[PDB]
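Researcher: Please translate sequence to structure tokens.
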Amino acid sequence: KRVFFSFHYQDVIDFRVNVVRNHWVTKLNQSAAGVFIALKRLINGGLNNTSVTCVLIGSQTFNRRWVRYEIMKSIEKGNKIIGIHINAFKDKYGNIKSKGPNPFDYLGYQYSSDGKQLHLYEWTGGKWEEYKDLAPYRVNQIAPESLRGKFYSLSSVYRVYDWVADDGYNKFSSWVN
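Model: Translation complete:
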């Protein structure tokens, strides 16, 4: 499978992102996409010809505008989506850090009462607000009453791993498959 990696730029600079990305692309010789209305177009193109989105979670990832977009756009496109904490191993400065917030806790959705549309929300610091960088969209899929008119945080939907705790060295390819 072709994997879209989503991340804070600072985690690229600190050689945290490359630990996971190099495992997939070099060690396992697979292929990745990633970015480090125009910028959305670029990201959309990156997400095209991928089937899995992998959010690499560092200290500030939860707060990044285009990480949020990459996640929301990934849902609309029907990508598999997972998160992986990347703070538990040493960065290029030789430091280990505590886990950052789960980006999925800061994003959410609600199905419309007729079940035909999906409304999108993000946490803006003191409240939930309608998400502005991606429009609500039509779901062509069945939407049972038990799913309608209820708010869900994305952390109730997508799975999060830790590279060290969950042994990504042995298990990453299973997480995206």
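Researcher: Any highlights?
Model: The beta strands are 3-6, 32-33, 52-57, 80-85, 107-111, 117-123, 128-130, 137-138, 151-153, 159-162.
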